[PDB]
Nucleic acid binder design. Structure first.
Ligand SMILES: [Zn+2]
Ligand SMILES: [Zn+2]
Ligand SMILES: [Zn+2]
Ligand SMILES: [Zn+2]
Lengths: 94, 101
DNA sequence: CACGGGTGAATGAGGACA
DNA sequence: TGTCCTCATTCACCCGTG
């Protein structure tokens, strides 16, 4: 069922363990990495939609966490780097 | 669709949630940031335009809100600070990230 | 194919200044 | 007051492993 569980936009698949759109995967990863602190400028129960997500980050992010996206599935820097060190330890194995 | 919805001028994009001209963006943020209460020198029904614009702060501000602008999107003095700082911390982390090259 | 990361052009928030 | 500039975020797309 290809609809993003966060904002309702068209979903491209599972991301960090949940059916999401490209925008929410991106939003969610970046938010978790930069350990961002967000606050609702309203009531902290915003209804996220494809056209408002950009605005309440707090709620959008609490929403990713509630549908089950998992920060754990985001590679770490050390992890990315070891990878690059194989994507060129392989393009040098080839 | 372009075209400021408050003044009729050419808009630069959405500001605090409504398509507006650079000037109304400015006007709207200052106003709300002061709590500024205005009172109209005429009849509370001023037709606003790219011209008479700066004349009735009361009506312009009231028109802003009907068009859909939101004081909630104007950043708070606390938020702004956390930004100038969040600018610097990532700044010293790009520095340290450099050294260990 | 599915899903990690990454990139870059567009968005829009604030601010100096005439 | 209103430019016009800076700079962080956003997301459509694309690359590469599994
Ligand atoms: Zn989404
Ligand atoms: Zn909210
Ligand atoms: Zn305007
Ligand atoms: Zn008036």
């Amino acid at each position: 069922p290809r609809i993003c569980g966060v904002c309702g936009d068209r979903a491209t698949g599972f991301h960090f363990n949940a059916m999401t759109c490209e925008g929410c995967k991106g939003f969610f990863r970046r938010s978790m990495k930069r350990k961002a602190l967000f606050t609702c400028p309203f009531n902290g129960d915003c209804r996220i939609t494809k056209d408002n997500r950009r605005h309440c980050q707090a709620c959008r992010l609490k929403r990713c966490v509630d549908i089950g996206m998992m920060k754990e599935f985001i590679l770490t820097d050390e992890e990315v780097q070891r990878k690059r060190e194989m994507i060129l330890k392989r393009k040098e194995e080839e």
